[PDB]
Design a protein around this ligand. Structure first.
Ligand code: MG
Ligand code: ZN
Ligand code: ZN
Lengths: 96, 228, 293, 1135, 95, 141
RNA sequence: CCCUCGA
DNA sequence: TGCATCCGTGAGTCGAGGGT
DNA sequence: TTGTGGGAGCTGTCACGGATGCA
């Protein structure tokens, strides 16, 4: 928890290196989610591999569905088994 | 623009059809005006809150001797019309001494209602008062220059955010201002704009030569120093 | 001098101007650009996703053209389109036409999300929606004292719900905190005797919009009242510019010792009799009272 | 007096003295005329015969046909539009979320000239939505109105604007058609005349003149008199014809290689080619009367002609000199003047039928694209009128229009008057109209041409003021879309009975007198000198020899709702607008009661509103039940009217029709058979007659508050019925389909006791806050089971799929009786959206009594909320024990300028008590003028005060003398209208006579029950993590910016922080604060607002590297822990 | 902008609702009826049931944590489930 | 301002605003208007930059102008600033961007690597810290 | 966000 | 190069419930 | 993937300051 005593708050221009140092993977596909299964398409704007898991402690394919498995990255999914909260603080990027 | 024919009827008698129709022009013009006027006043209030927000009281007294002189009053003294907003609630800058040696109000008193009454009763016609114009504090203002907190009646407490109270006090009645400007003029001054219809002033003391053409005035000032 | 203001700034602690040209675009986390299913089987997406999708589509089509060794005119067309789609993503409408959604509505870009009275600054940081707050019609209630307000029972019960729950478990009316919750939600008759206990001496803030000055928010001591309306002491009307032709007011419950103390001391109605603009009193007899006296 | 144009209508005796020579037209005619034109109904045709008849559809079809191919070989032409029957009745569409539509067929004839063959066919166009008998539409189940839209008529318009800097008087002209490209001509600061075409740069007008064919000398000959045209031609860049066309094309297409012939083609297509450019018959007539062209009444073609362009250019250059006259080749003495944008001869309205036609046309053209596309890609002998026509774009156009247009609106159905005025509205905004950011103040003003057309009183107080008006009583829209008003023709000084309908245009050429003008019984202007009006709000006295027309009636300027305010002319326009608006917010009460004091307008507004059941034909009542009414005509045929019973309106008010006839009764055509929601025996009854006292009462009616007798609670006189529709669906989700079930997790058998076997609440149950109405469960997933839920499921071996409770509950503060359940299934064949399996609506009815906080008002803008409901024994009472019903504070009346409310009160008393003027030894003087059969009245008589012709002051004072007494011979109200009241609290009499009387009071649809709201804690927005908004969503109040200024000015730092972190945004501090309060300990310290992190993330998304640093200068990590709570979870499971 | 009405409408059919601070707080507070029932069990039984069907470990792992053979962890598990089924009469309040 | 000096401008402006409010029967105490006017006269334009790092023509707060003048051992004449421009030119880029013209303020703050001291109350409001006023002052806190 | 309404 | 033009900035608060 | 083939809207806003660009 942040003690909320920040001295200063500073801007500058981001370098492409900074933009890649923030990113968790490149969004390569325009598709959002399957019209049938309502699940985030891989490499899309809602992909779970880079942005994060939609459901708490659940990977994309279901091989790791528990709080017991925590921190590990599913070698079949590429999805990190953690809280869904991460989907509000993990940026992707796009290589132009 | 006023209609030449007046509504000769009272609402007790009951207006005719044309009187009623005619009355609606102005009725609705005013109802519609109210929305734009309240938006204008609100924008001004937001800008004032922003410009004044960090102004807070920081210390009790900067101990300055600077201030401004306010008038309080051919056979008798006529109370000044503007005592309520410039003299009252100020901190007295210098002792108020009457025609005799009496000390009516001492330097650094509140100038409440009893004090202003005692001042007028003693023939005092001018007083020096502390102001935030003359306040010497680096950041913000000091309590003694600001005077009493209008909300509490006592002298302003050290933490008060008087910028927001000032912006609110100026904005709140802004919707009362109707029709160089009214509320447009308040905005013109606060925005520090070059005013429409600007009256030039003298750059130096001297003599005036006034060339009076047709729709063309030409003023020349010859300085007392003798310069250009 | 104009031109120097830029160069001198780029001439301090690195900060190379290369950052003004981009080879990689950052993509905002997906929670901040939601997509929700609607009644009907249709979806509603934030504009940000359509903008990023146009960027992605055009960048991929440019990749395809570069691979196919397309004519230079066509690849240049695609590069210009990519520039324009990133321009839309960042600040739509700033150059040329804005990317439009249905109804010829310009999609709100990342710049719009920050500007205006709807952007994050004015809409979500300098003011926000709060918990422990209610709203209702106001009625006069002339029997009150200056420091008091009539707070409806069904408002007080909700506003104080966790307090009355703790007390319900304190006095054994409930066995656990979950049953206390169920009790307050079912409005079992035990709660009301407890309610008047917790409400006592706990100040609440009343606000009436538009708040034109600080006296547009004032603290009161709540008296439990019969009915569904807030009773508002008749002498504070002038301060709120409140009449009783349908005005409504908002109730806010301070929680912390500090917030309650600020309410009792700084904001209590009977401590704010004087106008903070003119120094004169405002809680003065106004119309009927005048004709009485 | 009798008002007997309606059969069986109650006897409302009228104080009016002038005679109405004309009757109020069908108040729904504005919509029925329009739609029956669009359709081409038989009725419409007959009307045409009385007056070349084509219908809106026929017009689209003839404009579109014939459809030739690029080679002129094969032609498709649409011939006849016809309609099938309606697919389903109105109530059936409402129940099943359908659209009340009829199938549209057309006759499609395809010709092949190369083979000479002809294939006719009947082609189906789509399910065309239908207007009801009430002038509305049912769209996807809900009832809707298409509001008429105020647009500027096609034409040519000149205005004068002073120059920005130079202070020179500049002139501009806009040629604006009903469809196509705009044209503009503008003179600059410099004296060059310029043409602006579709916002392009201003080329010299000489460029266009030479591109049309006019040579340099041919131009100098005509425009030489104006040294402006000679100056701009000497300043012209190039001189020639095809070079001019070249420059036109160059400026018209940027980044484009110009070509002379394609420039010729494009320019001839833009304005003179009837394909994509059309100013309608309105625009043609407007420009022809504006410039003087074609005065032999030729209406053959409606397109921009070259001669029209030349005439407008010359008009502009001569208006720059401002000469009062002009003449064109063949022109006719044309006045030169600027145009008023707001004058109702230049501002027309597109009604419903035209609004629909304008979308039909778009769909048809999009379909014609596909027709021309199919004609090439298809085998020429294998095609048919069915293979070309794709009706997808037409159906999509109609659907889009009714479903997204600003002008297709949720019908407001508080009461019949609401819907009646809504159908009659004139709205300024919309597509093709003016936009809201361009809504100046002058479009909102009352314009002198609105007289008799748009009511100057009825309009909104808030942001829509002057943008929404309502049509005047006697007004009618002409086929051009202009509003006409009737006038009696005055021949040389006699006022005949010939009625002529004038537009605002034709009105300024004449002069108009008033309905208030004395005349002898034979007919002649016995008034010696008149006070009249002419153009631009003239007001002048004049001899009756110059008066051309006179008003047909007072209230001619007034709308329906406005014409229902007794003593309107005693009320200032502000409170009168308030009264007109608040009538349309009255709620229907359980028992409806017509006003003792009304105008002649109530009855005729109820009938035309439609919520009243009226007999189509004369007959005898064969049967009457609460459920239906059967009349046996003299024909031998029967007719049965089914009663709407406790239907829910769009706004939650109860639409309950009730029969007013008895079995055996004789009824005529046009007689009301059953009352509607706010009707009483055929008349509009929006409120109740209340015994009022005008006096302060102990501050409980301070500052507009109202005091009520508890009688109004006990006798249900201000009780209303309100019906909510709670709807919930079981649909397919990411973890499987939801199920509507009685098996709810974490719920005891007790709380389900009122549900049936399937999980829906049982009909007739009483329901309170949080009661399940429909049990539902949503697939959850094992990771989302709480540790307690996981333990319980393991121990008791529950193999059932893990679900979370997503039941539909009763929302906070709502309660009532379950009136009806309606359910649709996918197992059964029921139209449902995709993925939606089960749908169920529970209807709940609450009987709301009047309460502290409810809003009441009279008809004169006299609004208040209820401050206190006193026991009957506490009210001030009259000398015979009668407690007054409502106490209105005296201080509220005089400064609002509505003593109508007082005058009504007086008349209300008189009508309640009944009177008999002496009339012995002659009729008195005050009664001489009007009263006649008003010389006496029985108690609780029903009287009308027509606006501007009602009960005069002297006659009112006279009735207050001859008031009949009560049952003991006591006169309780003196000749001033005052009475001695006893203080019911103490018993002592009040020291002074108080005005008491009867006043009509309405229960406005602003009730505490709807408005009380409180939230401790609830839902949060996913984007910002701040509380949701709105009562319906259980939201939190917005502590806005000015509120934070208020909090700062106090120096209340901790309150401000707590409001801005733990009460909204701090996602861990929220939980820890609720936890602290529940555990009885001190509230913790705030965290970081989530919205600040959201701001930083948005900035990073803008490539801004915003970091937050510590004292050291090191970036701070803005994230939370993973296992921050491990000890206490074990502690809570007891391990 | 995504409407609050839209957020709530969507929450009506989602595996997890728009949860309130109070719900979270209660979930982070003891479930008294359940905690007392678990504390009634002996240590070995409570630990076996907790490891088995609260944390969901596989039985061999539950063995390796309590260093007892698989059979006796299974014995402790089934018998602690029985004892808790007896101890929890508030299943009827929730079932 | 340039003729009679700053002390006289402040008098002029307070009086000329009070006149508008007086002609409409509105009583504003002078001290509020003076609090606003004071913020219009807090900077000086640099005519000759002398030996300091100030770009000529820039508007510099009188306190920091005189402080950096004292430590360099500089031609500064007072400026009258409108309230909107005195607001957009504050040492807090957060305060400026949240007030008005957000895109421009943020572009400049980026180019200039501006570092917000986070000391104003509004800034403290935005981040969730106790405002430096009233009960949030260290003296009382 | 828009529409209609409320103070 | 000296302005005129064009462009970009801003235009009150909080509520209700119905929609894309 | 082959005779032919340019949208639907729109302005019915206003005041002010300063870069932009133009002769
Ligand atoms: Mg009010
Ligand atoms: Zn996986
Ligand atoms: Zn000082």
């Amino acid at each position: 928890l942040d003690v909320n005593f920040f001295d200063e708050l500073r801007i500058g221009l981001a370098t492409a290196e900074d933009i890649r140092q923030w990113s968790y993977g490149e969004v390569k596909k325009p598709e959002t989610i399957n019209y049938r299964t309502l699940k985030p398409e891989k490499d899309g704007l809602f992909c779970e591999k880079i942005f994060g898991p939609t459901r708490d402690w659940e990977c994309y394919c279901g091989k790791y569905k528990r709080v017991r498995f925590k921190g590990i990255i599913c070698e079949r999914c590429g999805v990190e088994v953690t809280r869904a909260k991460v989907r509000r603080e993990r940026m992707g990027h796009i290589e132009l | 623009e006023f209609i030449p024919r007046p509504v000769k009827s009272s609402f007790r008698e009951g207006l005719t059809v044309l009187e009623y129709f005619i009355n609606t022009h102005g009725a609705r013009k005013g109802l519609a005006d109210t929305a734009l006027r309240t938006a204008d006043s609100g924008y001004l209030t937001r800008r004032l809150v922003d410009v004044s927000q960090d102004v807070i009281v920081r210390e009790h007294d900067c101990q300055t001797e600077r201030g401004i002189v306010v008038e309080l009053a051919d056979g008798t003294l006529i109370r000044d019309p503007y005592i309520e907003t410039s003299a009252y609630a100020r901190t007295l800058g210098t002792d108020a001494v009457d025609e005799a040696g009496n000390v009516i109000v001492e330097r650094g008193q509140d100038l409440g209602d009893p004090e202003i009454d005692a001042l007028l009763a003693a023939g005092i016609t001018q007083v020096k008062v502390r102001s935030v114009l003359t306040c010497a504090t680096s950041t913000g203002v000091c309590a003694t220059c600001y005077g009493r907190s209008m909300a509490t009646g006592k002298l302003v407490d050290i933490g008060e955010a008087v910028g927001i109270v000032a912006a609110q006090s100026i904005g709140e009645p802004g919707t009362q201002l109707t029709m160089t400007g009214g509320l447009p003029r308040v905005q013109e001054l606060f925005e520090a704009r070059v005013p429409r219809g600007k009256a030039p002033i003298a750059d130096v003391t001297g003599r005036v030569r006034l060339e009076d053409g047709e729709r063309f005035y030409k003023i020349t000032i010859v300085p007392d120093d003798g310069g250009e | 001098l104009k031109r120097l203001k830029v160069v001198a700034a780029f001439q301090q602690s690195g900060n190379s101007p290369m950052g003004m040209v981009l080879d990689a675009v950052p993509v905002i986390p997906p929670e901040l650009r939601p997509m929700v299913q609607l009644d009907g089987g249709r979806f509603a997406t934030s504009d940000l996703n359509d903008l990023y999708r146009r960027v992605i589509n055009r960048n991929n089509r440019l990749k395809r053209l570069i691979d196919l060794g397309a004519p230079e005119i066509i690849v240049n067309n695609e590069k210009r389109m990519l520039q324009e789609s990133v321009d839309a993503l960042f600040d739509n409408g700033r150059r040329g036409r804005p990317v439009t959604g249905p109804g010829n509505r310009p999609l709100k870009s990342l710049s719009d999300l920050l500007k205006g009275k709807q952007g994050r600054f004015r809409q979500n940081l300098l003011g926000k929606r709060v918990d422990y707050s209610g709203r209702s019609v106001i009625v006069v209630g002339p029997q009150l004292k200056l420091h008091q307000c009539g707070l409806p029972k069904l408002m007080a019960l909700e506003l104080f719900k966790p307090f009355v729950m703790k007390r319900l478990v304190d006095l054994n009316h409930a066995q656990n905190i979950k049953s206390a919750k169920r009790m307050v939600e079912r409005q079992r008759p035990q709660v009301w005797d407890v309610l008047e206990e917790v409400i006592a001496e706990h100040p609440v803030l009343l606000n009436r919009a538009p708040t034109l000055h600080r006296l547009g928010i004032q603290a009161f001591e709540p008296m439990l009242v019969e009915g569904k309306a807030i009773q508002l002491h008749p002498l504070v009307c002038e301060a709120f510019n409140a009449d009783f032709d349908g005005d409504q007011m908002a109730v806010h419950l301070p929680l912390s010792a500090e917030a309650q103390a600020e309410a009792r001391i700084l904001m209590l109605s009977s401590n704010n009799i004087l106008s903070p603009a003119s120094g004169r009193p405002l809680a003065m007899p106004r119309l009927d009272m005048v004709t009485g006296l | 007096s009798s008002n007997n144009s309606v059969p069986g209508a109650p006897n409302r005796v009228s104080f009016a003295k002038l005679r109405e020579p004309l009757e109020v037209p069908g108040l729904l005619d504005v919509q029925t005329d329009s739609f029956e034109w669009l359709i081409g109904s038989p009725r419409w045709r007959e009307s045409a015969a009385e007056r070349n008849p084509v219908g809106g559809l026929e017009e689209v079809l003839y404009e579109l046909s014939p459809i030739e191919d690029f080679s002129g070989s094969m032609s498709l032409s649409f011939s006849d539009p016809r309609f099938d029957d309606v697919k389903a009745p109105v109530d059936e569409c409402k129940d099943k979320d359908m659209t009340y539509a009829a199938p549209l067929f057309v006759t499609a004839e395809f010709i092949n000239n190369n083979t000479g063959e002809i294939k006719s066919q009947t082609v189906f166009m789509g399910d065309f939505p239908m207007m009801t008998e009430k002038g509305t539409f049912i769209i996807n189940g809900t009832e809707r109105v298409v509001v008429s839209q105020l647009v500027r008529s096609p034409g040519v318009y000149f205005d004068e604007t002073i120059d920005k800097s130079t202070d020179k008087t500049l002139h501009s002209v806009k040629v604006i058609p009903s469809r196509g490209a705009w044209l503009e001509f503008d003179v600059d600061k410099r004296d060059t005349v310029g043409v602006r075409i579709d916002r392009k740069r201003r080329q010299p007008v000489t460029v266009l003149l030479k591109a049309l064919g006019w040579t340099s000398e041919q131009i100098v000959e005509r425009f030489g008199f104006s040294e402006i045209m000679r100056s701009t031609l000497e300043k012209d860049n190039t001189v020639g014809t095809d070079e001019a066309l070249l420059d036109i094309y160059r400026k018209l297409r940027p980044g484009e290689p110009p070509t002379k012939e394609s420039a010729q083609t494009l320019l001839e297509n833009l304005f003179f080619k009837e394909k994509r450019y059309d100013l309608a018959r309105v625009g043609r007539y407007k420009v022809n009367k504006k410039l003087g062209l074609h005065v032999g009444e030729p209406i053959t073609s409606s397109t921009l002609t070259e001669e029209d362009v030349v005439a407008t250019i010359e008009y502009l250059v001569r208006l720059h000199e401002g000469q009062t006259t002009m003449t064109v080749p063949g022109g006719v003495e044309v006045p030169v003047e600027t145009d008023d944008i707001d004058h109702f001869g230049n501002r027309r309205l597109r009604t419903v039928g035209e609004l629909i036609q304008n979308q039909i046309r778009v769909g048809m053209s999009r379909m014609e694209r596909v027709v021309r596309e199919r004609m090439t890609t298809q085998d020429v002998e294998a095609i048919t009128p069915q293979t070309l026509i794709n009706i997808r774009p037409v159906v999509a156009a109609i659907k889009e229009f009714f479903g997204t247009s600003q002008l297709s609106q949720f019908m407001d159905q508080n009461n019949p008057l609401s819907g009646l005025t809504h159908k009659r509205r004139l709205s300024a905004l919309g597509p093709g109209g003016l936009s809201r950011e361009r809504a100046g103040l002058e479009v909102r003003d009352v314009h002198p041409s609105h007289y008799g057309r748009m009511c100057p009183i009825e309009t909104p107080e808030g942001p829509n003021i002057g943008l929404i008006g309502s049509l005047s009583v006697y007004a009618r829209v002409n086929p051009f879309g202009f509003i006409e008003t009737p006038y009696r023709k005055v021949v040389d000084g006699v006022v005949s009975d010939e009625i002529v309908y004038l537009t605002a245009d034709e009105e300024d050429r004449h002069v108009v007198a008033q309905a208030n003008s004395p005349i002898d019984a034979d007919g002649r202007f016995v008034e010696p000198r008149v006070l009249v009006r002419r153009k631009a709000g003239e007001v002048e006295y004049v001899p009756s020899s110059e008066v051309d027309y006179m008003d047909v009636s007072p209230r001619q300027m007034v709308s329906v709702a406005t014409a229902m305010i007794p003593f309107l002319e005693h009320d200032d326009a502000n409170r009168a607008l308030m009264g007109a608006n608040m009538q349309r917010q009255a709620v229907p009460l359980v028992r409806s009661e017509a006003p003792l004091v009304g105008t002649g307008m109530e009855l005729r507004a109820a009938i035309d509103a439609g919520d009243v059941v009226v007999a189509e034909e004369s007959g005898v009542i064969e049967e009457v039940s609460a459920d239906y009414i059967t009349v046996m005509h003299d024909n031998g045929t029967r007719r049965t009217y089914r009663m709407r019973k406790f239907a829910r309106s769009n706004h939650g008010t109860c639409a309950n029709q009730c029969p007013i006839v008895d079995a055996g009764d004789r009824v005529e055509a046009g007689q009301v058979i059953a009352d509607g929601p706010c009707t009483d025996d055929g008349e509009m009854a929006l409120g109740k007659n209340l015994l009022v006292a005008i006096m302060p009462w102990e501050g409980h009616n301070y500052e507009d508050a109202i005091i009520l007798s508890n009688r109004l609670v006990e006798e249900d006189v201000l009780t209303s019925i309100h019906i909510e529709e709670h709807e919930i669906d079981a649909r397919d989700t990411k973890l499987g389909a939801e199920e509507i079930t009685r098996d709810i997790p974490n719920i005891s058998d007790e709380v389900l006791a009122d549900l049936d076997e399937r999980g829906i609440v049982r009909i007739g149950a009483e329901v309170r806050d949080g009661d399940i109405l429909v049990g539902k469960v949503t697939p959850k997933g094992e990771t989302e089971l709480t540790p307690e839920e996981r333990l319980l499921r393991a121990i008791f071996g529950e193999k059932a799929r893990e679900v979370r409770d997503t039941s539909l509950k009763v929302p906070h503060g709502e309660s009532g009786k379950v009136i009806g359940i309606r359910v649709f299934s996918r197992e059964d064949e029921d139209e449902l959206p995709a993925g939606v399996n089960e749908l169920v609506r529970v209807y709940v009815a609450q009987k709301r009594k009047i309460s502290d906080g409810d809003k009441l008002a009279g008809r004169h803008g006299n609004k208040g909320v209820i401050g206190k409901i006193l026991p009957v024994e506490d009210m001030p009472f009259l000398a015979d024990g009668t407690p007054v019903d409502i106490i209105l504070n005296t201080h509220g009346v005089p400064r609002r300028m509505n003593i109508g409310q007082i005058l009504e009160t007086h008349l209300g008393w008189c009508a309640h008590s009944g009177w008999k003027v002496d009339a012995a030894k002659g009729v008195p003087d005050w009664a001489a003028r009007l009263p006649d059969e008003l010389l006496e009245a029985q108690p609780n008589a029903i009287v009308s005060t027509p606006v501007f012709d009602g009960a005069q002051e002297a006659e009112l004072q006279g009735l207050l003398s001859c008031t009949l007494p009560n049952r003991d011979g006591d006169v309780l109200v003196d000749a001033d209208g005052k009475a001695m009241l006893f203080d019911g609290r103490s018993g002592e009499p009040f020291p002074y006579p108080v005005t008491v009387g009867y006043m009509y009071i309405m229960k406005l649809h602003h009730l505490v029950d709807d408005k009380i709201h409180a939230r401790s804690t609830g839902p949060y927005s996913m984007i910002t993590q701040q509380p949701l908004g709105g009562k319906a969503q259980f939201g939190g109040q917005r502590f806005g910016e000015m509120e934070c200024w208020a909090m700062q000015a106090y120096g209340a730092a901790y309150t401000l922080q707590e409001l801005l972190t733990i009460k909204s945004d701090d996602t861990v501090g929220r939980v820890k604060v609720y936890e602290a309060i529940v555990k009885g300990e001190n509230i913790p310290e705030p965290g970081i607002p989530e919205s600040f992190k959201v701001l930083l993330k948005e900035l990073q998304s803008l490539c801004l590297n915003v970091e937050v640093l510590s004292s050291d200068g090191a970036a701070i990590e803005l994230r939370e822990g993973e296992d921050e709570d491990l000890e206490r979870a074990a502690a809570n499971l007891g391990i | 902008q995504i409407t609050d009405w839209q957020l709530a409408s969507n929450a009506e059919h989602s595996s997890t609702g728009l949860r309130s601070a109070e719900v979270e707080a209660l979930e982070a507070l003891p479930d008294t009826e359940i905690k007392e029932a678990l504390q009634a069990l002996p240590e070995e039984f409570r630990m076996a049931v907790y490891y088995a069907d609260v944390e969901g470990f596989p039985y061999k792992e539950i063995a390796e944590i309590m260093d007892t053979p698989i059979g006796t962890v299974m014995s402790r598990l089934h018998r602690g489930r029985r004892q808790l089924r007896g101890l929890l009469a508030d299943v009827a309040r929730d079932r | 301002l340039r003729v009679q000096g700053p002390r006289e401008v402040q008098i002029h402006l307070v009086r000329e605003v009070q006149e508008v409010y007086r002609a409409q029967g509105v009583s504003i105490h002078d001290k509020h208007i003076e609090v606003i006017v004071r913020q219009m006269l807090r900077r000086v334009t640099i005519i000759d930059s002398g030996s300091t790092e100030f770009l000529p023509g820039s508007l510099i707060d009188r306190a920091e102008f005189e402080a950096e003048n004292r430590r360099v051992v500089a031609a500064g004449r007072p400026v009258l600033m409108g309230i909107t421009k005195a607001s957009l030119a504050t040492d807090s880029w957060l305060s400026a961007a949240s007030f008005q013209e957000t895109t421009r303020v943020l572009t400049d703050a980026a180019i200039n690597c501006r570092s917000d001291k986070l000391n104003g109350l509004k800034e403290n409001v935005i981040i969730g810290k106790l405002i430096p006023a009233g009960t949030g002052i260290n003296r009382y806190r």
